[PDB]
Amino acid sequence: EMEKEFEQIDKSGSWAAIYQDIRHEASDFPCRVAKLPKNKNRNRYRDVSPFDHSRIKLHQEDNDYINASLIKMEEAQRSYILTQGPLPNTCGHFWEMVWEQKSRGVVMLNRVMEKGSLKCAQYWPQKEEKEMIFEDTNLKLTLISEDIKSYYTVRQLELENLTTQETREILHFHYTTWPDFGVPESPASFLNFLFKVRESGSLSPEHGPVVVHCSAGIGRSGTFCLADTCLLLMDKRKDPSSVDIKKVLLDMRKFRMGLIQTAEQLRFSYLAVIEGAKFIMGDSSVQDQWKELSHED
């Protein structure tokens, strides 16, 4: 019973404690490749590595390493690629991962700059006229269009494998309004952003896994994935009441470490699922009842 738990935990102020218990129980698997000295420069963070077992292997015989993990939610029937914000030398690898994994959507939960610092490189072209060519990986990236809404931007990018003369359309979902500190006070904008991602077909099993990133690819990306998977299971199970966000979270941490970085992000995910479930579970009156909330013109 999740509404219960939220109130019960908030009233008692045991968020850190509930959270820390999840940290303590979190799985732990080797990250051998990630720690190899030749991949030091592919890791934005030394303390944030993909497990060897779920890491995404680039299909280059060169060095197949990218700080990216495959989160496969078996019961939820959805896979996500959680990755760090590309570094300046790993932007070609990122797009190569996108390409080789058949990903249709890329979900960015951060801004290139946050807290006065760079949390991710400018890995996509800001201008239609200034396409980017990834020479190391031989990919061409072109901004086709963008749709700037108040809390997110949906971009239509064109990824061209220059080697095969083959082109794909990549939808870029960029939640631009996540605050520098703390989480959104309401899950409204995140959830509406989540539903457009879903609505685009980017998360369908017909495509490769959606590529979700933030700066380290664990906190906000974990929020996105946890919330989306918990929403999948509720509106799938005999009783939605049976979905346990902590167990969902722990199954996700089997695939990538540290998903959800603060007790506030864990609380934000409980908020998000609690609110997301209300709207879909049975308010026949709406589906997307995030008018004023997300505002929209």
Partner: peptide, 6 residues
């Protein structure tokens, strides 16, 4: 504190 992360 130092560049990387937790």
């Amino acid at each position: 504190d130092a560049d990387e992360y937790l």
